[PDB]
Amino acid sequence: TNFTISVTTEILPVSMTKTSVDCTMYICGDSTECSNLLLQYGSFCTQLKRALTGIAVEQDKNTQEVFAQVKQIYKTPPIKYFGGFNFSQILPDPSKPSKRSPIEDLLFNKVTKGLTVLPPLLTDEMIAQYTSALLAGTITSGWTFGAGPALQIPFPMQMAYRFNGIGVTQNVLYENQKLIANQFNSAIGKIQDSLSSTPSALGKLQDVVNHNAQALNTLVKQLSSKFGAISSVLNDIFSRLDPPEAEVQIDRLITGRLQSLQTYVTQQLIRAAEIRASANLAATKMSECVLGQSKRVDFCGKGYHLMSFPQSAPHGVVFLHVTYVPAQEKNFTTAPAICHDGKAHFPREGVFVSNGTHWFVTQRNFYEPQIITTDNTFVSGNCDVVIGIVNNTVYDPLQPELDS
Amino acid sequence: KQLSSKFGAISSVLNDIFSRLDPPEAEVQIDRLITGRLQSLQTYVTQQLIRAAEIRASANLAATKMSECVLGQSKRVDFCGKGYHLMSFPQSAPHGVVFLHVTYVPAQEKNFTTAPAICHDGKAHFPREGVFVSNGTHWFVTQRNFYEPQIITTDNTFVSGNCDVVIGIVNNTVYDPLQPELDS
Amino acid sequence: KQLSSKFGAISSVLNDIFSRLDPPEAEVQIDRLITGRLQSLQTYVTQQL
Amino acid sequence: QGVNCTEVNVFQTRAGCLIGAEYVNNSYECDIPIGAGICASYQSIIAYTMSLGAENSVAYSNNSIAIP
Ligand SMILES: *[C@@H]1O[C@H](CO)[C@@H](O[C@@H]2O[C@H](CO)[C@@H](O)[C@H](O)[C@H]2NC(C)=O)[C@H](O)[C@H]1NC(C)=O
Ligand SMILES: *[C@@H]1O[C@H](CO)[C@@H](O[C@@H]2O[C@H](CO)[C@@H](O)[C@H](O)[C@H]2NC(C)=O)[C@H](O)[C@H]1NC(C)=O
Ligand SMILES: *[C@@H]1O[C@H](CO)[C@@H](O[C@@H]2O[C@H](CO)[C@@H](O)[C@H](O)[C@H]2NC(C)=O)[C@H](O)[C@H]1NC(C)=O
Ligand SMILES: *[C@@H]1O[C@H](CO)[C@@H](O[C@@H]2O[C@H](CO)[C@@H](O)[C@H](O)[C@H]2NC(C)=O)[C@H](O)[C@H]1NC(C)=O
Ligand SMILES: *[C@@H]1O[C@H](CO)[C@@H](O[C@@H]2O[C@H](CO)[C@@H](O)[C@H](O)[C@H]2NC(C)=O)[C@H](O)[C@H]1NC(C)=O
Ligand SMILES: *[C@@H]1O[C@H](CO)[C@@H](O[C@@H]2O[C@H](CO)[C@@H](O)[C@H](O)[C@H]2NC(C)=O)[C@H](O)[C@H]1NC(C)=O
Ligand SMILES: *[C@@H]1O[C@H](CO)[C@@H](O)[C@H](O)[C@H]1NC(C)=O
Ligand SMILES: *[C@@H]1O[C@H](CO)[C@@H](O)[C@H](O)[C@H]1NC(C)=O
Ligand SMILES: *[C@@H]1O[C@H](CO)[C@@H](O)[C@H](O)[C@H]1NC(C)=O
Ligand SMILES: *[C@@H]1O[C@H](CO)[C@@H](O)[C@H](O)[C@H]1NC(C)=O
Numbered sequence: 200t201n202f203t204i205s206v207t208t209e210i211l212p213v214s215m216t217k218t219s220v221d222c223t224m225y226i227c228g229d230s231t232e233c234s235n236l237l238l239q240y241g242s243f244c245t246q247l248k249r250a251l252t253g254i255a256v257e258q259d260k261n262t263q264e265v266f267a268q269v270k271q272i273y274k275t276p277p278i279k280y281f282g283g284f285n286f287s288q289i290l291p292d293p294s295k296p297s298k299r300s301p302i303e304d305l306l307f308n309k310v311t312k313g314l315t316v317l318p319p320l321l322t323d324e325m326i327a328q329y330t331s332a333l334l335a336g337t338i339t340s341g342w343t344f345g346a347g348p349a350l351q352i353p354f355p356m357q358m359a360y361r362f363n364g365i366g367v368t369q370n371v372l373y374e375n376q377k378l379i380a381n382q383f384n385s386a387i388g389k390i391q392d393s394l395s396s397t398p399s400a401l402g403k404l405q406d407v408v409n410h411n412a413q414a415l416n417t418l419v420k421q422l423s424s425k426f427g428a429i430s431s432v433l434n435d436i437f438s439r440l441d442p443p444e445a446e447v448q449i450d451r452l453i454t455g456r457l458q459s460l461q462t463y464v465t466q467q468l469i470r471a472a473e474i475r476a477s478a479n480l481a482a483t484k485m486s487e488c489v490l491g492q493s494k495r496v497d498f499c500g501k502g503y504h505l506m507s508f509p510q511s512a513p514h515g516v517v518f519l520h521v522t523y524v525p526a527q528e529k530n531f532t533t534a535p536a537i538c539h540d541g542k543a544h545f546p547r548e549g550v551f552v553s554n555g556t557h558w559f560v561t562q563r564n565f566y567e568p569q570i571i572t573t574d575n576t577f578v579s580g581n582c583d584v585v586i587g588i589v590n591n592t593v594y595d596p597l598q599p600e601l602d603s
Numbered sequence: 604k605q606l607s608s609k610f611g612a613i614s615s616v617l618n619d620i621f622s623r624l625d626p627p628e629a630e631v632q633i634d635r636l637i638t639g640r641l642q643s644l645q646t647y648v649t650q651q652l653i654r655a656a657e658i659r660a661s662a663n664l665a666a667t668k669m670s671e672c673v674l675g676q677s678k679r680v681d682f683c684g685k686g687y688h689l690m691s692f693p694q695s696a697p698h699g700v701v702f703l704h705v706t707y708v709p710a711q712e713k714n715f716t717t718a719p720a721i722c723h724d725g726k727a728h729f730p731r732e733g734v735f736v737s738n739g740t741h742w743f744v745t746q747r748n749f750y751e752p753q754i755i756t757t758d759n760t761f762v763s764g765n766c767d768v769v770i771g772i773v774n775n776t777v778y779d780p781l782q783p784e785l786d787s
Numbered sequence: 788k789q790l791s792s793k794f795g796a797i798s799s800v801l802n803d804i805f806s807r808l809d810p811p812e813a814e815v816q817i818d819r820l821i822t823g824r825l826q827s828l829q830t831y832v833t834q835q836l
Numbered sequence: 837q838g839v840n841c842t843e844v845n846v847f848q849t850r851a852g853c854l855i856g857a858e859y860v861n862n863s864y865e866c867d868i869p870i871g872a873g874i875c876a877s878y879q880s881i882i883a884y885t886m887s888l889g890a891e892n893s894v895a896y897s898n899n900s901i902a903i904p
Binding site: 709714 | 899902903
Binding site: 275317318320329332340343352355356 | 889
């Protein structure tokens with residue numbers, strides 16, 4: 200008999216910081232003779248370079264598939280009034296230098312040598328602009344811009360269509376529009392406070408960053424490891440050991456470093472495959488839950504999905520999956536059919552509901568009793584074949600027209 | 604190309620090494636060469652496993668796509684093509700497949716004055732499945748995808764309560780189709 | 788099979804090598820057999836991951 | 837990348853410095869990524885910022901629907 204506002208958050212990493220280290224300085228440092236020795240050993244360094252370039256381009260493809268899904272850039276209207284709803288928590292703040300939402304700024308603040316790193320092609324500013332454009336598209340134009348050109352639609356019409364997608368009429372939305380807006384604002388504030396009070400909410404990105412840091416530290420330690428040699432420094436060996444000698448020592452050092460770096464490359468590309476699967480799932484979530492209304496069960500969060508409000512995140516993306524969860528149930532009498540004039544009557548779109556005295560019709564998700572008439576019911580078969588049928592009359596609206 | 608590398612040996616040919624070097628160290632050189640080729644093969648087969656896993660994942664994704672929007676019609680939006688998908692005719696490919704997806708795209712948009720419902724006879728006439736539009740002086744009901752004007756009647760509109768709680772309603776007459784039969 | 792393999796060493800048991808061979812080159816044989824066991828086990832854990 | 841060309845028409849970006857490109861204030865679409873939102877394309881060589889897309893921001897109306 201009552202509606203409860205529901206919203207759940209989801210965390211999905213997208214990409215990590217790509218790295219590219221030259222093999223010669225990584226293994227042999229500045230030794231020219233070591234480079235000459237590894238020249239004829241094989242084309243392993245070319246394979247590593249090709250692999251890292253492939254990882255970089257597939258991470259870029261994953262990022263542009265997750266974020267850059269629209270060919271048009273949308274800007275929010277200056278009038279921040281859509282019938283009474285609040286959009287300050289999701290709209291970017293012009294006063295902030297990062298041009299991000301307060302929730303986006305909060306999640307950015309929460310998320311915190313012989314090696315080189317490459318910055319991403321698209322920084323957080325363009326991702327934030329893409330998210331703001333798609334939020335403007337899904338607010339002002341709804342899902343019309345998803346399947347073609349952007350078409351203006353009223354926001355109450357958007358909630359009415361979203362409620363009718365799951366089987367809720369617009370009369371209860373019209374009756375409690377202010378209540379719906381107040382409940383949505385209260386839920387948004389509550390989840391904002393919960394995200395501000397939860398340091399482990401974004402634990403997936405922190406886990407990925409910590410795993411990368413542990414991997415690079417372990418590889419640095421393996422570089423510092425002697426691997427069962429006289430010393431871990433090639434220059435001291437060259438300045439002390441015989442130049443005809445120590446060839447086997449430096450060969451075992453470089454092949455141990457090669458084994459360590461190939462283990463690192465294999466685990467990095469397997470983690471890249473894992474994050475590619477995660478980015479594919481995120482892309483499906485963008486294509487189905489975000490651009491339009493998805494009727495899929497338990498795909499866009501807990502409960503009946505209404506709309507989702509994705510936002511930019513460092514090395515990932517967040518999910519503001521606003522859903523609907525019913526509450527305040529009550530016992531009611533059930534009958535599969537109504538026996539009127541020897542014929543069985545069935546509800547066209549609802550279920551027969553009674554409190555013990557009078558039989559009515561209501562939807563399966565909300566308690567909206569209505570007078571059982573001829574237009575909202577269809578008649579087929581008889582009463583003896585069906586089981587559980589009860590006796591009641593059916594009002595005919597056509598009769599009083601010609602009764603007078 | 605991995606077979607044409609010395610791998611730390613004096614030469615890439617093994618028969619000459621066996622003929623020249625003493626077998627006590629020739630066997631060590633042969634062991635080093637074959638174990639280096641063994642790491643080459645293990646890297647190649649690990650790359651093959653990664654490629655096979657990626658190909659299997661892509662094949663599973665394609666199987667889900669063809670189960671959704673090839674055998675029938677998928678109600679999901681933008682799952683297998685931009686816009687509203689209608690039908691698809693996929694074609695064969697060597698060691699692959701191509702999905703020829705046909706979609707529906709609207710065109711020729713036009714502005715229309717709209718109202719949430721119609722306040723007539725002290726009651727609100729909400730649309731059952733359409734949306735009310737106006738061209739400036741007359742009101743019509745249309746769908747959410749195509750401009751199909753129609754006179755607002757009692758069959759296509761349902762009434763649930765009065766027309767004062769709602770915001771932004773307008774006043775317009777509702778034609779009852781049952782009246783003209785007994786009007787005469 | 789990998790732990791039972793000699794991996795080009797003299798014996799698969801370190802006790803016989805320690806009690807028979809001199810301390811020179813015994814650590815070389817031990818290192819060779821254990822690193823064969825290593826490369827086998829990193830390959831193994833790669834297929835299991 | 838990663839350094840400045842002063843300590844080696846040069847334009848210096850966050851990712852690095854590119855030699856032989858002329859910076860243009862107009863923003864176009866590039867085919868070869870570089871990094872940090874900087875894009876370069878042939879025709880000597882023009883350097884610019886990657887275009888996000890076409891700009892279209894229709895005014896929101898609570899009484900007008902663009903029905904096709
Ligand atoms: C559904 O439950 C909510 C929560 O109790 C009701 O909202 C309350 O409404 C009363 C008066 O209508 C207010 O005094 C309270 O402040 C409201 N509480 C909250 C948390 O909003 C709502 O009225 C219920 N729905 C119906 C149809 O009765
Ligand atoms: C939307 O919600 C925000 C957040 O609560 C509202 O901003 C508050 O406004 C009051 C005055 O109306 C101030 O006292 C608070 O300090 C503001 N809070 C924050 C976090 O800025 C805002 O008024 C609401 N309405 C609109 C239209 O934005
Ligand atoms: C079951 O619900 C119906 C619908 O509200 C009730 O019928 C009305 O009840 C009110 C007060 O309860 C009366 O003022 C109306 O005159 C009743 N209308 C009709 C057509 O009977 C009915 O009383 C309820 N029954 C029980 C046992 O609670
Ligand atoms: C619902 O009403 C029908 C008739 O409107 C009832 O059918 C009658 O049942 C009695 C005894 O079971 C017979 O003597 C009559 O001849 C039946 N009438 C007809 C027209 O067949 C039916 O029993 C009622 N249901 C319940 C649960 O009482
Ligand atoms: C809105 O549409 C209605 C329905 O077509 C128009 O009413 C007719 O308009 C035509 C010419 O536009 C006249 O020839 C008919 O006589 C009109 N019908 C009646 C019953 O008078 C109406 O003119 C349109 N209004 C606008 C502003 O375009
Ligand atoms: C639609 O018609 C109703 C009914 O006449 C209008 O409601 C009247 O509004 C005036 C203006 O304040 C009041 O003096 C009357 O008492 C109202 N009548 C009733 C029965 O409540 C309403 O204003 C009309 N709306 C439009 C947009 O024309
Ligand atoms: C219906 O009545 C039963 C019997 O007391 C009770 O166990 C159940 O909780 C009731 N359900 C509702 C929704 O009131
Ligand atoms: C509707 O009117 C607005 C405001 O004049 C305009 O911006 C928009 O392009 C119009 N749309 C159509 C389809 O005519
Ligand atoms: C549409 O919005 C404007 C300003 O936000 C408001 O003045 C107007 O009354 C709204 N339209 C309706 C029908 O309420
Ligand atoms: C550019 O060169 C200046 C020296 O004039 C130096 O201070 C600065 O750090 C360089 N920029 C970068 C990104 O290194």
